[PDB]
């Protein structure tokens, strides 16, 4: 479901902006997978982000900033195609990306970086997911 992806994400967001200090009043099995994923952006966060490049440097959104633009940028952390280590990247890099919008007085941005992801992860990361065990599957790895 593309409306379970959408509460996914903005689940994973509330939880970053409220960890890191700002609002997050920008807007069971589903349970398990929003704690296994905000368990595994901490862990990449803490652990393993700082091994690679800091995508947040190749992207500056404003309110002009097209999906496009968004999706070329995140296309990079998928260059090797997918895998949940990098679909966990691929939320903390939202989180961070809103962290950074709040910051600079642009948190109206934090619903559209939400939409895109919602957007980006529908069509670019959920064919894999299907292919690969489903959300459960990240559970029983990652949980
Ligand atoms: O196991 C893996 O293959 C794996 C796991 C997690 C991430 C990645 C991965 C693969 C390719 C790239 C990356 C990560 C990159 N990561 N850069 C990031 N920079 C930031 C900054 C803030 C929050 C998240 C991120 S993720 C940018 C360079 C391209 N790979």
Same mark, same amino acid.
């Given at each position: 479901?593309?409306?379970? !992806?959408?509460? %996914?994400?903005?689940?994973? %967001?509330?939880?970053? %902006?409220?960890?890191?200090?700002?609002?997050?009043?920008?807007?069971?099995?589903?349970?398990?997978?929003?704690?296994? %994923?905000?368990?595994?952006?901490?862990?990449?966060?803490?652990?393993?982000?700082?091994?690679?490049?800091?995508?947040?440097?190749?992207?500056?959104?404003?309110?002009?900033?097209?999906?496009?633009?968004?999706?070329?940028?995140? !296309?990079?952390?998928?260059?090797?195609?997918? !895998?949940?280590?990098?679909?966990?990247?691929?939320?903390?890099?939202?989180?961070?990306?809103?962290?950074?919008?709040?910051?600079?007085?642009?948190?109206?941005?934090?619903?559209?970086?939400?939409?895109?992801?919602?957007?980006?992860? !529908?069509?670019?990361?959920?064919?894999?997911?299907?292919?690969?065990?489903?959300?459960?599957?990240?559970?029983?790895?990652?949980?």
């Amino acid at each position: 479901m593309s409306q379970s !992806n959408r509460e %996914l994400v903005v689940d994973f %967001l509330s939880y970053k %902006l409220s960890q890191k200090g700002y609002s997050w009043s920008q807007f069971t099995e589903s349970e398990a997978v929003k704690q296994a %994923l905000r368990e595994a952006g901490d862990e990449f966060e803490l652990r393993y982000r700082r091994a690679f490049s800091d995508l947040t440097s190749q992207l500056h959104i404003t309110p002009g900033t097209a999906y496009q633009s968004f999706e070329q940028v995140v !296309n990079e952390l998928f260059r090797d195609g997918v !895998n949940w280590g990098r679909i966990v990247a691929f939320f903390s890099f939202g989180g961070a990306l809103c962290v950074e919008s709040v910051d600079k007085e642009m948190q109206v941005l934090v619903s559209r970086i939400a939409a895109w992801m919602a957007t980006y992860l !529908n069509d670019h990361l959920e064919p894999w997911i299907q292919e690969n065990g489903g959300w459960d599957t990240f559970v029983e790895l990652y949980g």
